[PDB]
Amino acid sequence: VPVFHLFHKLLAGQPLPAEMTLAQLLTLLYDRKLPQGYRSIDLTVKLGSLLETCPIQSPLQVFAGMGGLALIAER
Amino acid sequence: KQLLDSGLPSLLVRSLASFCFSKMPITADLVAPILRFLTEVGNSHIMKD
């Protein structure tokens, strides 16, 4: 099929779904013991269920995790 | 790996803290270039750690 499937070195043999967002991909890679805060994501394009993975914690959630937003309304 | 072992980033970050409370002396005209140096070298996850 003349379509493009994206791959990753760590998730070898499993083409990624086209509907996945990048946050889920970061979650999957960090599950695969990829070093934290890596500079890039090395995907490979090759011609021709994981959507449930939780998106990674954005900085706002981390700030709101320890009730940081409570101080915001105080000022 | 050997950039941090030379102690230059550690030498810099101490000078940043010394200047902020207002050895290599730092003027206000040099803080931004070395902050940009820290940001640029920070692409590697080793620096982020």
Curated annotation (Swiss-Prot), chain A:
Protein name in the entry: Dual E2 ubiquitin-conjugating enzyme/E3 ubiquitin-protein ligase BIRC6
Role summary: Anti-apoptotic protein known as inhibitor of apoptosis (IAP) which can regulate cell death by controlling caspases and by acting as an E3 ubiquitin-protein ligase. Unlike most IAPs, does not contain a RING domain and it is not a RING-type E3 ligase. Instead acts as a dual E2/E3 enzyme that combines ubiquitin conjugating (E2) and ubiquitin ligase (E3) activities in a single polypeptide. Ubiquitination is mediated by a non-canonical E1 ubiquitin activating enzyme UBA6.
Cell compartments where the protein resides: Golgi apparatus, trans-Golgi network membrane; Endosome; Cytoplasm, Cytoskeleton, Spindle pole; Cytoplasm, Cytoskeleton, Microtubule organizing center, Centrosome
Subunit structure: Homodimer; antiparallel. Interacts with RNF41. Interacts with DIABLO/SMAC, likely with higher affinity to SMAC dimer than SMAC monomer; this interaction blocks the substrate-binding site and inhibits the caspase inhibition activity of BIRC6. Interacts with KIF23/MKLP1, USP8/UBPY, BIRC5/survivin, MAP2K1/MEK1, RAB8A/RAB8, RAB11A/RAB11, PLK1, EXOC3/SEC6 and EXOC4/SEC8.
Recorded domain comment: The BIR domain is essential for its anti-apoptotic function and is important for binding to DIABLO/SMAC and caspases.
Protein family according to the UniProt entry: Belongs to the BIRC6 family.
Provenance organism: Homo sapiens
Post-translational note: Ubiquitinated; mediated by RNF41 E3 ligase and leads to proteasomal degradation, impairing inhibition of apoptosis. Deubiquitinated by USP8/UBPY. Autoubiquitinated; mediated by E1 ubiquitin activating enzyme UBA6.
Gene assigned in the entry: BIRC6
Tissue expression: Expressed in brain cancer cells.
